[PDB]
């Protein structure tokens, strides 16, 4: 117990890892195995799983991980070096991908859990891509090995083939996102570990070679593990490992030495308990009491694999070798996360992970208490130590060095090291660790930086959390009793603190809309709101998706707007963007902060924009990386460039605001390029004020966008389903019924299941999972994630189209309807006022 606390001082003996993977792949069960290994009094029941990290009532009822859980435990190594591991057990459901990112930012390593039978899935690919984006070390663990034995009954050669295909597919996926060659994976490299958390099996090549060397002696387990995978064979005539098969049917080294003993032990335990199990256990040195042989097949198998394999030292050595410690892993984290960069003095100090440096925490999670009235922040300490009952300065996502408004001084109360079910109170937490900070909840909303007050004033904030996918599902939430309206708001605040991707916004009409990723995510959000935060009756509107606005044609006429001062005139035109350019802006392929000489060269090369015209780019909207581009095209001899640059900032804010609030239905604007064609700026400095230019800039943006042919854009989800080969036609029928088209239908290699990948409208995806599972009688399962915005069919400005309430409109009537009702939901006017 005390050794765990004393182990935090050494930053080299700490590993900050996050266990991420597809839904139901064994991460929680693996953490349960680690907890049982560390805790003698914690053992799973024979029938029910343990689910140590599944602490929420929702998790224990839904059976799905909802929130990331921190587990800080001391694990022995293969040699016995007791390392300190901070494991972030993240949900596997794609809808909760944000919950992974909260745990992914404060982690120096990623453990990708992959089911042996299923293989690489949707969330697995998303998580490896995202983790590579945050420049994290990636190690792979193939869980549920027994599914190749006890379920598929594959031959050991075919089990090896399936494992090799699984490992080689992740290698071909990381190459698509990581330029570094060190991100390759191979079990002989120590990158890849094998496990079956249901039966407490956990081995790498090094660990199993260590078992061999303990059994027989005089074996170099490192050298032995170097030849325990791949096309290398074993010749007992020379007792040597040869790249060529000694005999006609010589099995590979992995098959002969690793998969063969595991297959045989599992076969003996599950088939020959009464006849050959005692003999094979004497052969393996395992001694089980008479009562331990009376257990059913599954508890007996778990017990015998616990005895034979012992501790989970393979996982520990993989993580230690291939996941950097906070001391060595701080520099890329600081570069990718700290806004001031590594060149900053504070960045340089934080790169050393000094426990005696200035305090710099990075809170990414916020965990509620039992009563739900107090929240405990959770974050990684990057420099210095945090002490209990100590005044600190808590920044915010909007804080800047110029603006001390977003920073509030708060006293840190008790500090906890959090391990799943329980928390151990501590006095101080040195750098490189994970800490539950109490008393700093009030200024923190989503993500904050904690530093010391009255010192280290030149301390910026860490970058705001960047999420894998956009949240487009929108639900309006009201109280049943309006008298209880504040409580809901209070509850709303709490869920905003508890869900990283949640977005609560009050509309013009007074409807409070919550933004979520999917049906299960919003279901959990409303359960939390109703049952623990608000504790009041709540009315929920029918779910709806958010829309965007685009153009398909150049504006017919040059659209002019003049300020109320009647001295400034802006004449603009609107053009649609090229294919992929908006995605390039969104993916941060190009930034407005790039050097201007090469910024124009990008558009001159990939899109052949004129060098002078490309250099005329002002900014992107509505954000820094927003998919809308504002380009100047004024005649140099007709507008004074120096004078135009004076109001350039005001025009930029007007553009950003107008693109963030569309004219059609008060929504975002995507894939539009606004060209400024004429500027007439008042020569007097005070007659070109921002308070007049910005509304005028928004008005001219609206006019140009309206004159250009408006179109509504709806989100399309990418859905992959794993179903028996017979159920493919049923999936096709359901998707065709819900306006979705199948892009691919590929069999899963090494399993009869087929994976069907399709694109569905997001507004047509409500109940699609239920429809698919009920129609196929539960054999087909689907996971849906937002993929891309697509133009909805129909003209959205067609006034002649009549909308019938309580009828699903045809396709050409969609774009119009999707506008009008949305406007009615926003409290806007009945139709688009072009004259406004």
């Amino acid at each position: 117990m005390d050794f765990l606390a004393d182990l935090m001082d050494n930053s080299e003996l700490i590993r900050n890892v996050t266990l991420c993977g597809h839904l139901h792949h064994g991460k929680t069960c693996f953490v349960d195995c680690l907890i049982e290994q560390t805790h003698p009094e914690i053992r799973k029941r024979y029938d029910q799983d343990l689910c140590y990290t599944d602490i929420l009532f929702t998790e224990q009822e839904r059976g799905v991980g909802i929130k990331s859980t921190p587990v800080t435990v001391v694990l022995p190594d293969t040699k016995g070096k007791s390392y300190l591991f901070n494991i972030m057990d993240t949900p596997g459901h794609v809808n909760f991908s944000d919950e992974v990112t909260a745990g992914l930012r404060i982690s120096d390593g990623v453990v990708l859990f992959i089911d042996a039978a299923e293989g690489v899935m949707l969330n697995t690919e998303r998580l490896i891509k995202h983790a590579v984006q945050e420049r994290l070390a990636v190690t792979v663990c193939i869980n549920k090995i027994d599914r190749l034995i006890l379920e598929l009954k594959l031959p050991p050669t075919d089990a090896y083939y399936k494992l090799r295909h699984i490992v080689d597919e992740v290698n071909g996926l990381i190459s698509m996102y990581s330029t570094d060659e060190n991100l390759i994976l191979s079990p002989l490299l120590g990158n890849v570990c094998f496990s079956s958390s249901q039966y407490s099996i956990c081995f790498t090549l090094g660990s199993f070679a260590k078992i061999y060397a303990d059994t027989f002696g005089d074996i170099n387990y490192q050298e032995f593990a170097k030849r325990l995978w791949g096309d290398i064979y074993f010749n007992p005539k020379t007792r040597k490992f040869t790249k060529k098969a000694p005999t006609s049917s010589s099995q590979r080294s992995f098959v002969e030495f690793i998969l063969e003993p595991l297959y045989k032990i599992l076969a003996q335990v599950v088939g020959d308990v009464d006849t050959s199990l005692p003999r094979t256990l004497d052969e393996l040195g395992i001694h089980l009491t008479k009562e331990e042989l009376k257990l059913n097949i599954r508890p007996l198998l778990r017990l015998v694999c616990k005895k034979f394999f012992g501790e989970f030292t393979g996982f520990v050595d993989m993580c230690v070798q291939h996941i950097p410690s906070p001391k060595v892993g701080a520099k890329p984290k600081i570069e990718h996360t700290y806004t001031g960069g590594v060149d900053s003095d504070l960045g340089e100090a934080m790169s050393d992970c000094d426990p005696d440096g200035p305090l710099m925490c990075h809170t990414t999670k916020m965990y509620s208490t039992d009563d739900g009235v107090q929240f405990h922040a959770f974050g990684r300490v990057l420099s210095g130590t945090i002490h209990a009952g100590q005044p600190v300065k808590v920044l915010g996502e909007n804080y800047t060095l110029e603006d001390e408004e977003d920073s509030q001084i708060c006293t840190v109360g008790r500090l906890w090291i959090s391990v799943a079910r329980y928390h151990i109170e501590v006095n101080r937490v040195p750098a490189g660790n994970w800490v539950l900070i109490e008393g700093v909840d009030q200024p923190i909303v989503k993500t904050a930086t904690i530093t010391e007050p009255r010192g280290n004033e030149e301390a910026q904030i860490f970058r705001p959390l960047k999420f894998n996918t956009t949240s487009v599902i929108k639900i309006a939430v009201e109280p049943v009793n309006p008298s209880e309206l504040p409580k809901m708001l209070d509850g709303l605040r709490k869920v905003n603190k508890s869900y990283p991707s949640l977005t609560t916004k009050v509309e013009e009409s007074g409807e409070h809309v919550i933004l979520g990723t999917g049906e299960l995510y919003l279901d959990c959000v409303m359960h939390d709101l109703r049952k623990m935060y608000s504790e009041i009756d709540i009315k929920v509107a029918d779910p709806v998706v958010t829309f965007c606005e685009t153009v398909v044609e150049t504006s017919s006429l040059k659209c002019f707007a003049e300020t109320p001062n009647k001295k400034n005139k802006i004449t603009m035109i609107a053009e649609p963007l090229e294919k992929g350019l908006a995605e390039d802006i969104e993916n941060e392929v190009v930034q407005i902060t790039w050097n201007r000489k090469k910024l124009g060269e990008f558009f001159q090369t990939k899109y052949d924009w004129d060098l002078l015209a490309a250099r005329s780019i002002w900014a992107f909207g509505p954000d820094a990386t927003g998919p809308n581009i504002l380009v100047d095209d004024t005649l140099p001899s007709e507008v004074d460039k120096a004078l135009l640059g004076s109001v350039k900032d005001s025009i930029v804010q007007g553009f950003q605001w107008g693109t963030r609030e569309g004219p059609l239905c008060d929504e975002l604007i995507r894939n539009v390029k606004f060209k400024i064609l004429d500027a007439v700026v008042a020569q007097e400095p005070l007659h070109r004020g921002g308070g007049q230019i910005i509304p005028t800039a928004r008005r001219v943006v609206y006019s140009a966008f309206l004159m250009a042919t408006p179109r509504l854009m709806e989100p399309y989800y990418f859905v992959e389903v794993q179903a028996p080969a017979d159920c493919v036609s049923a999936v096709y029928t359901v998707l065709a019924r819900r306006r979705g088209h199948v892009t691919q239908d590929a069999p899963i290699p090494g399993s009869p299941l087929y994976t069907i990948k399709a694109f569905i409208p997001a507004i047509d995806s409500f109940g699609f999972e239920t429809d698919l599972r009920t129609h196929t009688q539960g054999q087909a399962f689907s996971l849906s994630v937002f993929h891309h915005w697509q133009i909805v069919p129909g003209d959205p400005l067609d006034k002649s189209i009549v909308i019938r309430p309580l009828e699903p409109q045809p396709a050409p009537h969609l774009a119009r309807e999707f506008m009008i009702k949305t406007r009615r939901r926003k409290g806007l006017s009945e139709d688009v006022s072009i004259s406004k």
């Binding site: 080969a725 017979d726 049923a730 539960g778 054999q779 309580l806 009828e807």
Partner: protein, 122 residues
């Protein structure tokens, strides 16, 4: 007809005597959605069968999708073993049916006691 069923459902959502029998009006398994009416029964990999129902009839009501998949994927060598197993099982079942046949297919001298009492009970 069924098109108006969906609209009617949407509108409805938004806008003495001993009876041994159960009334047919109590039935809940009535749906307008073709997905929820003609559900996809579990094939169970072509090797699992619903309880109670006889296996012989269940085999002939199978979708044949998995049978076609097997006869397509199987190589000749592994096809011969399955053919031999099918022939052996067919011969065993033919012998069982031959022994368990009606008295109309047996002569009086070769009648067994069970068949004798079956004939008498008729």
């Amino acid at each position: 007809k069924d098109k108006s069923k969906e609209l009617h459902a949407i509108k409805e959502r938004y806008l003495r005597k001993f009876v041994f029998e159960w009334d047919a009006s109590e039935d809940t398994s009535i749906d307008y959605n073709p997905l929820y009416k003609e559900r996809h029964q579990v094939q169970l990999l072509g090797r699992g069968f619903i309880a109670g129902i006889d296996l012989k009839q269940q085999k002939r009501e199978q979708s044949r999708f998995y049978g076609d998949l097997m006869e397509k994927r199987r190589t000749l060598e592994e096809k011969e073993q399955e053919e031999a197993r099918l022939r052996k099982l067919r011969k065993k079942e033919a012998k069982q049916r031959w022994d368990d046949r009606h008295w109309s297919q047996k002569k009086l001298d070769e009648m067994t006691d069970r068949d004798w009492r079956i004939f008498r009970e008729d």
